[PDB]
User: Fold Glutamate receptor 2 from Rattus norvegicus.
Amino acid sequence: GELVYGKADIAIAPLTITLVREEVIDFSKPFMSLGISIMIKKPQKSKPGVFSFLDPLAYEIWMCIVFAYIGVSVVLFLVSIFNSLWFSLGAFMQQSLSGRIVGGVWWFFTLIIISSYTANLAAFLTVERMVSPIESAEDLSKQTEIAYGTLDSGSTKEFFRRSKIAVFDKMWTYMRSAEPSVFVRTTAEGVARVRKSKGKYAYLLESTMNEYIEQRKPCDTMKVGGNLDSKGYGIATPKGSSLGTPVNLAVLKLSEQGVLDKLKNKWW
Amino acid sequence: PCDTMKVGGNLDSKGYGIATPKGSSLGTPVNLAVLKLSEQGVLDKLKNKWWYDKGECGAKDSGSKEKTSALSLSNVAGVFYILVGGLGLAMLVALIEFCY
Amino acid sequence: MLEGNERYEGYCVDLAAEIAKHCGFKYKLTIVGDGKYGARDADTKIWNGMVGELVYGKADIAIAPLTITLVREEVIDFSKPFMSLGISIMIKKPQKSKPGV
Amino acid sequence: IFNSLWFSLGAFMQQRSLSGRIVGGVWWFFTLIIISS
Amino acid sequence: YTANLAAFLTVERMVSPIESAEDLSKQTEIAYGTLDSGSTKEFFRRSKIAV
Assistant:
């Protein structure tokens, strides 16, 4: 209102470019691209438990070795009743020509398994490999353990409301019937809800603000996956002003000489 | 054959546009009509049309390759196939010992 | 077998009809010369390309993936960007190799 | 106890009753993991 | 034998190359390049960024 009413001549600020603002003043070309990204708290994975003890061998090897135990402990029944299983449970306990190469290929078989369980068990106490989070936004919509929402009023809530794309429509039919209120009051209240959720709540916002929180304390959020839409800021001048075109031709000289990206790499 | 994959973000910020002659009559109205189609989502809908929809690797854009925490079942198979290969060779010698 | 605007299909072909829907004008689809872009010679200082056919009167508007640059902005009027992009990385995604006995 | 710790230290070492036979089995796979751990 | 098995598991557990511009600039096994004449090559020429 300070440009159309004359209370200002030019404006340089993170101002989104829209169609309604273009019918009153003159917008320049964008100086920084952004879009709706995803922000989540770093997978710390400081939650030790039993589901991580059997993590070495997979859910299919732990359950495949027993088919070899009872498969060898029952062969000792045949190569020699309630005493053979009493000897084989006492044989698979501590580590005729038929029964000879039975408990030896079974040795060399339990060789590699005990050799392999120890090998990979060192591979995840070396690097926590902590950073393994959901990134694709289409993956964020197919679950309900971890809630997600947006701002109660803004350009972000109106993006999912009128979308004729299949992936984004289901994201909307959730937050409309999701109780309790998955919507926050301000942007300062939305960032404070992901931090006190033990990693059970998410927030969507622009990639300029999402790429800025990741590099600030307490250093826990991380932008995951590409953005959802395409948008950019700009500079405005009054219609017919003597600085509308002179400034528009100046910004494009900045991005080509690597100045806008050196500024984006400076304050971020 | 969907053997490529975009890794990381973009290094620089650039974009395409529609061009009109300087002072052309259809200059501003198209500039306004472009903002109308971007906000109406018609731009990202048509972007999703000829890329993912009519694209030949629509399936190669949903699957993910991550660092598995566990050990592979395949390498352990080389041991199970040499164990049962000994259990079977063992029962072949039990019969020649029961007759002699 | 087709003729006119039905011959060509793609992102811009649907973009053309949608631009001609909120501005209403009979548009004829034409292909520029030799798949040309916006460039300027150093010796002759002659422009060529889709940008060239807009300053020389052989066309009225150009709709294509045209990189928005300063040397192109001083001569024609660019609309707002309808598609953001950037230089990225392409690596052959591996890890499809299968362990064997 | 003088012969049970004699046999438990001797059964800690290497990695005829069905009840005692299954005792020898669970103690290996438990110590086998801690030695691996 | 058990000692050699754990070395290869940890090398690949490093997960390389990770997705980034610098990881591509840090190793030289998997080389990298652009186009000979275009807006892509001229980008790195006059770039005053360390990476």
Q: What stands out?
A: Chain D has two helices and no strands. Chains D and C do not touch (no CB pair under 8 Å). Helices of chain D lie at 4-13, 18-36.
